[PDB]
Amino acid sequence: AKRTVKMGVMGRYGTRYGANPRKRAKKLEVSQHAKHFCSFCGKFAFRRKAVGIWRCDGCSKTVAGGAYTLSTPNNSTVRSTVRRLREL
Amino acid sequence: TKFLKPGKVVIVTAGRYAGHKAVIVQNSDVVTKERPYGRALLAGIKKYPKKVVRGMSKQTIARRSQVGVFLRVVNHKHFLPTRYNVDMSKELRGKINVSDASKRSRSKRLVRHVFQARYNAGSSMWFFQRLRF
Amino acid sequence: TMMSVLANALRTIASAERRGKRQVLIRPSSKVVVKFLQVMQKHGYIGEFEIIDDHRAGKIVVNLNGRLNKCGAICPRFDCATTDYEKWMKNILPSRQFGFVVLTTSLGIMDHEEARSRNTGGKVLGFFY
Amino acid sequence: DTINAKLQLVMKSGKYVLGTQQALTTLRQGRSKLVVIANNCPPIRRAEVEYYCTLSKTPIHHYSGNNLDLGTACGKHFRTCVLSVTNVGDSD
Amino acid sequence: VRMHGNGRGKASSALPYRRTPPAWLKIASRNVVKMVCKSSRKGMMPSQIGMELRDSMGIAQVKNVTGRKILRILKHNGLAPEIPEDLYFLVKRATQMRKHLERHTTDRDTKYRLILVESRIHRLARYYKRVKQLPPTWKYES
RNA sequence: CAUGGGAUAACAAAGGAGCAUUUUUAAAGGUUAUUGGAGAUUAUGGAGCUGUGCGACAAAUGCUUUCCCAUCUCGGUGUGGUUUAGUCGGCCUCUAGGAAUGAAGGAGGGUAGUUCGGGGGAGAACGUACUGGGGCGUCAGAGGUGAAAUUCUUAGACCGCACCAAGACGAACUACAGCGAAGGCAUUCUUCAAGGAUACCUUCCUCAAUCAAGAACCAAAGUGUGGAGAUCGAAGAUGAUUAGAAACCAUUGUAGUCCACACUGCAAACGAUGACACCCAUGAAUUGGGGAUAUCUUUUCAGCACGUUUUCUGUUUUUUACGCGAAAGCUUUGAGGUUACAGUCUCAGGGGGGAGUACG
RNA sequence: AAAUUGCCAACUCAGAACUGCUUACGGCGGGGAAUCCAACUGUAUAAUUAAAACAUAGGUUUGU
RNA sequence: GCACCGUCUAGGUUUGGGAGUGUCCCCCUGUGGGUACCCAACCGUG
Numbered sequence A: 001a002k003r004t005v006k007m008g009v010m011g012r013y014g015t016r017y018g019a020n021p022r023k024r025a026k027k028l029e030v031s032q033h034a035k036h037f038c039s040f041c042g043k044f045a046f047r048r049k050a051v052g053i054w055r056c057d058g059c060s061k062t063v064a065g066g067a068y069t070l071s072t073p074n075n076s077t078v079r080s081t082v083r084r085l086r087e088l
Numbered sequence B: 001t002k003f004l005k006p007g008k009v010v011i012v013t014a015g016r017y018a019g020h021k022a023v024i025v026q027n028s029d030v031v032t033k034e035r036p037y038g039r040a041l042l043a044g045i046k047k048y049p050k051k052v053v054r055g056m057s058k059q060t061i062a063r064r065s066q067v068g069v070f071l072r073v074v075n076h077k078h079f080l081p082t083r084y085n086v087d088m089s090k091e092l093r094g095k096i097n098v099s100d101a102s103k104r105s106r107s108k109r110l111v112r113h114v115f116q117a118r119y120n121a122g123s124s125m126w127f128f129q130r131l132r133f
Numbered sequence C: 001t002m003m004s005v006l007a008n009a010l011r012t013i014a015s016a017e018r019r020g021k022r023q024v025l026i027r028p029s030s031k032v033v034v035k036f037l038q039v040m041q042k043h044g045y046i047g048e049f050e051i052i053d054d055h056r057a058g059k060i061v062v063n064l065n066g067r068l069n070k071c072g073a074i075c076p077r078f079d080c081a082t083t084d085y086e087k088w089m090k091n092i093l094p095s096r097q098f099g100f101v102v103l104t105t106s107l108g109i110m111d112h113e114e115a116r117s118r119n120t121g122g123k124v125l126g127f128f129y
Numbered sequence D: 001d002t003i004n005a006k007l008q009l010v011m012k013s014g015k016y017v018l019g020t021q022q023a024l025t026t027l028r029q030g031r032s033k034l035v036v037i038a039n040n041c042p043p044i045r046r047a048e049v050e051y052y053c054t055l056s057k058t059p060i061h062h063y064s065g066n067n068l069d070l071g072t073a074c075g076k077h078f079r080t081c082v083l084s085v086t087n088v089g090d091s092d
Numbered sequence E: 001v002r003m004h005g006n007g008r009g010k011a012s013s014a015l016p017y018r019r020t021p022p023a024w025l026k027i028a029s030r031n032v033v034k035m036v037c038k039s040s041r042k043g044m045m046p047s048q049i050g051m052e053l054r055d056s057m058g059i060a061q062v063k064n065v066t067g068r069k070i071l072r073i074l075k076h077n078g079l080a081p082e083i084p085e086d087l088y089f090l091v092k093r094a095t096q097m098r099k100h101l102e103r104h105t106t107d108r109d110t111k112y113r114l115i116l117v118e119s120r121i122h123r124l125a126r127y128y129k130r131v132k133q134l135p136p137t138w139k140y141e142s
Numbered sequence F: 001c002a003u004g005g006g007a008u009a010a011c012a013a014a015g016g017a018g019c020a021u022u023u024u025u026a027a028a029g030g031u032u033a034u035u036g037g038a039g040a041u042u043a044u045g046g047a048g049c050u051g052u053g054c055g056a057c058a059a060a061u062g063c064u065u066u067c068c069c070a071u072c073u074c075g076g077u078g079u080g081g082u083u084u085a086g087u088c089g090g091c092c093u094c095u096a097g098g099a100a101u102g103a104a105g106g107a108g109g110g111u112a113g114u115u116c117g118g119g120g121g122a123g124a125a126c127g128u129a130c131u132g133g134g135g136c137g138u139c140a141g142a143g144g145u146g147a148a149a150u151u152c153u154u155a156g157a158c159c160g161c162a163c164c165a166a167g168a169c170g171a172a173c174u175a176c177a178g179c180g181a182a183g184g185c186a187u188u189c190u191u192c193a194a195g196g197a198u199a200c201c202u203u204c205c206u207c208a209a210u211c212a213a214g215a216a217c218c219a220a221a222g223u224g225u226g227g228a229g230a231u232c233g234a235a236g237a238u239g240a241u242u243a244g245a246a247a248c249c250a251u252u253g254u255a256g257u258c259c260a261c262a263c264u265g266c267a268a269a270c271g272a273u274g275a276c277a278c279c280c281a282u283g284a285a286u287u288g289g290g291g292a293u294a295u296c297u298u299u300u301c302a303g304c305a306c307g308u309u310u311u312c313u314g315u316u317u318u319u320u321a322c323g324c325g326a327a328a329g330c331u332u333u334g335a336g337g338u339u340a341c342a343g344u345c346u347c348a349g350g351g352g353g354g355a356g357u358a359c360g
Numbered sequence G: 001a002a003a004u005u006g007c008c009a010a011c012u013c014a015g016a017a018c019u020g021c022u023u024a025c026g027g028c029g030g031g032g033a034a035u036c037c038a039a040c041u042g043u044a045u046a047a048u049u050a051a052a053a054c055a056u057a058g059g060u061u062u063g064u
Numbered sequence H: 001g002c003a004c005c006g007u008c009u010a011g012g013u014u015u016g017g018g019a020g021u022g023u024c025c026c027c028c029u030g031u032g033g034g035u036a037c038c039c040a041a042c043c044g045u046g
């Protein structure tokens, strides 16, 4: 059964940091503890090991990524921009 | 298709002779109870001839130019085929035997003599180059 | 989506009669539509009509003498006992002297006067006068 | 995609083998008719399979998707890096 | 056209009243059956098979020649598609959209089209389950 | 509750390879009556169960087949049409397969013009302009208004030229035009899914219409977090104008305006007109796709493109027939086909307020 | 239908009958309705002040 | 003003001149070897 109604992983904090700071930290915590898709090896196995370090459980490849997500939107934009500048 | 021809140079990727170059003598794509895998009899370089430079005596050149040879049957998965070849005559392949111990030793001596002559003739020089890795 | 072929056919005939057309094309056709047309033709409210086969729901071309003031379908097909004929004549017919209510009886499709004479009830299909 | 239709047809009627090791086994024999490699494949493994295909004169196709996409296009619930069709099964 | 949209297109084919194959069509019924069966084995859906015969062999209608429909011929030989042909194409449609929407999350128009395609699938699949062309407990998965 | 009728319907089943010949005869094999009851035991046959033959029938689909190898002018008919006929075949393995309403001017798929479009997403570059900067000149005002002043200005404003920066935006072309479910959508190029219309002797075979509950999208304003901030500008300020002016006007100016993600889901979110389906008079047009057959261009996205005439399907419309309406008005785009009141579904209303308030 | 036969260990948790209490070791929250402060956990005047003070996540400025 | 200090280049474009033979066994294919230069002049700059 469901154990909490609204707060998920933030239920560890009890009642003692405020609804909105908990809400803001919740999304980044859930992202940083989730399994992220690995473009190598095609598995959902990327886990964070310290801020900005992502290691895949499948192929054991370690990548430098974002603080709480594997790839930041800025990184995708920069990759596309650099590819386009290479093709020019 | 069917490139695993006798005479084709292969590189062994497994076992004690990993990285050593070998020549297919007899290919066996049919499985048996004793050997339930695709296999091939490999005549391979156990010891490549050493680099010899100008200014060394005939004796040391002869010592450094000796070729060591191994003759074993190896699973297909444990060597990597190449496009290089060493010509194996039909009679020469027919002489190589691994049935008995004495026949195995005689075949090893024959393969050693043939490879030494091949190295002396300056043919298949890639086959006598040691793989660096 | 067309739900009632009979209602569509009777609506098309009534429109053509209001406009004073000589012929009207009915599409699609059905056994019930042809049975209804034969009842009206029996009492003289329409002329000859022709059924055109097209290996589907066919078409009907009806010749119209100007005797048909109005024809229409009654939806849903309400059940009608032999005692309910006078109620339906009162509700939908212009008079007790002319006009017909068409019924689906187990004896076939017939006008209310014929059904009353056969002592049979059924479901009301429509009317014409 | 044409390759997706061809792969679906081979799954339907032809004979095929999945995985790099079984593909290499079919290449060592004279059985492979077409080899499909995902763009996800590790470069050294792809080079080895391509070398086998060149030695065996086997056609080689570079799939536009990754191993997950190749597995999905095969109708499978797992990922395949290399596909080897042994019988086209009237495909091509 | 009509379902899931405001389109009112009438474009279609009008089958002829005269079903007899023309006198100049000398292909026998058995040879046509071999043609459709070998064309399916070549990997063509029933619709593609019919267009091939129509455009090249002069066979306007396979049914008017062999007495049987193309899908019926494939079923008799066991060549019928496992998933019905149209349900296959819609599922392929939804898959291709979803692959597109992975990279373009802001493509809200394709998201809107995706809802229609799936809400169409769940009625077509309901039909095939009720008609037992599909197994019970067959579910479309996103 | 019983019985009669079976037209209209309902329920159930199926989804069509997911399927299904009879009758003579003989022979071979493997806990019943009747023996006078009753209690065992036996064997003999019926009758079925298979297989071996045998005779007579059928058969909704041709085994006198099919496939696989191998050798090679005469009659009839009508007052001129009709089957001929004059001007390969013999062998060698198997073989259950063709009997199924039709394809709706209902739905869904397919293929094609690599069609059509300010449709969506992404990326790049372009264009002037506003603003701000310096560079090069100039010198006394410039700005703004009913008139002024707040404001800027020898510190060089304004103005002029060529430049930059940054953020918006995409003029004229731009229309009773196109696209989109609605909200909405205008530079070019390159891309990613789509969508519709048309064409079709492609496939399929009722799969549909509309909907409580339930779900998704949704202008602007507003909210949260990042970014951006050129322009304009709620609050505020100041100068005017006024009896007063917390406004309109002038100079400003914060939040906002722009982008990303997440909320919000209250618009005159209007055609103040729910969705689907049928009939429906007239004339000019218009957008897209197809049929058929006067003019212009015609060295390559080109057997082109446009354009004329006619037709057609689909779209947005306009002018002037019934009919309807309280009227204004609507009219194949209904608000028509309704007291001669019944095609289908659904939402909402029942004098004005209180009040879209109180409470939950 | 090994869905059966033999052996064997460790603790428990229930239910039942009978029979008792002098309510009888130690250990072990009193509770409720509110008001003012500080969000909270923390720190802190060794030797008279532990607090509402300090810190603290958050928030905003400044310089570079 | 003439000299001298004070000169060499990958690679690219390209002038003028050749010179070994597609060629040498295999043992058809296939295999194993070996050759396909020098110079000039302009870019270019290690």
Ligand SMILES: [K+]
Pocket: F103, F104
């Ligand atoms: K249809």
Ligand SMILES: [K+]
Pocket: G050
């Ligand atoms: K304390």
Ligand SMILES: [Mg+2]
Pocket: E004
């Ligand atoms: Mg609908």
Ligand SMILES: [Mg+2]
Pocket: none
């Ligand atoms: Mg100046």
Ligand SMILES: [Mg+2]
Pocket: F170, F187
């Ligand atoms: Mg423009």
Ligand SMILES: [Mg+2]
Pocket: none
């Ligand atoms: Mg806004």
Ligand SMILES: [Mg+2]
Pocket: none
């Ligand atoms: Mg904001």
Ligand SMILES: [Mg+2]
Pocket: none
């Ligand atoms: Mg902040």
Ligand SMILES: [Mg+2]
Pocket: none
């Ligand atoms: Mg301003």
Ligand SMILES: [Mg+2]
Pocket: none
């Ligand atoms: Mg409202």
Ligand SMILES: [Mg+2]
Pocket: F272
């Ligand atoms: Mg309204």
Ligand SMILES: [Mg+2]
Pocket: F178, F287, F288
């Ligand atoms: Mg258009």
Ligand SMILES: [Mg+2]
Pocket: none
């Ligand atoms: Mg009009």
Ligand SMILES: [Mg+2]
Pocket: G038
């Ligand atoms: Mg405190």
Ligand SMILES: [Mg+2]
Pocket: G041
């Ligand atoms: Mg503590």
Ligand code: NA
Pocket: G038, G052, G053
């Ligand atoms: Na305190």
